[PDB]
């Protein structure tokens, strides 16, 4: 169990596979990672970049619960968790904050109106599914890619060997198969 650049790259490689594979059930984990990064290094990316990605991840979590048929009581609990009532960057501007706050409120009201079972609910769910489908997810993945590129710039020279070293400490005496997610992260980040 580790820290430092290796720990950041482990969570980045895992998060990169989660978003590429569209594994919405692990999107909350990507959110904690990005929230940890923002707390220590707010200068990695602009505030608008960070919040666009985080809100996209939150919205998809809520949309997925709706599309999988979860009870509306559970949809609304996750909605209020990820989008609560309340409530920071040298260029954490007002125009970007306006658009960020505005996007939250329209999504909140959209989900609330869906939870009241309007007569055209089925039509609205197919619109919601398109609205937060493939093109939305591709743009989201692009935001994460640029975020992780900024993380790699702030880290020392990568070393591809750490994952196998760390996994052997956690699981001594057994054969650990090389992680494809780890190797794909190194390819996408341009590792030697």
């Amino acid at each position: 169990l580790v820290a430092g650049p290796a720990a950041l790259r482990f969570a980045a490689a895992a998060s990169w596979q989660v978003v590429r594979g569209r594994c919405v059930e692990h999107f909350p984990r990507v959110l904690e990672f990005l929230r940890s990064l923002r707390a220590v290094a707010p200068g990695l990316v602009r505030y608008r970049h960070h919040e666009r990605l985080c809100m996209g991840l939150k919205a998809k979590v809520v949309v997925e619960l709706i599309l999988q048929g979860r009870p509306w009581a559970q949809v609304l609990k996750a909605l209020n968790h990820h989008f609560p009532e309340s409530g920071r960057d040298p260029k954490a501007t007002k125009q970007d904050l306006r658009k960020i706050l505005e996007a939250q409120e329209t999504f909140y009201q959209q989900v609330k109106q869906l939870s009241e079972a309007p007569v055209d609910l089925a039509s609205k769910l197919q619109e919601l599914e398109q609205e937060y489908g493939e093109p939305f997810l591709a743009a989201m993945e692009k935001l994460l890619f640029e975020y992780l590129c900024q993380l790699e710039k702030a880290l020392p020279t990568p070393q591809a060997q750490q994952l196998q070293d760390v996994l052997s400490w956690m699981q001594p005496g057994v054969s650990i198969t090389s992680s494809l997610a780890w190797r794909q992260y190194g390819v996408d980040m341009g590792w030697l």
């Binding site: 329209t106 999504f107 743009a139 989201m140």
Partner: peptide, 12 residues
């Protein structure tokens, strides 16, 4: 149209 999360992610 008021800004949505969708359009905010898609823009720029």
């Amino acid at each position: 149209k008021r800004m949505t999360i969708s359009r905010l992610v898609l823009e720029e």
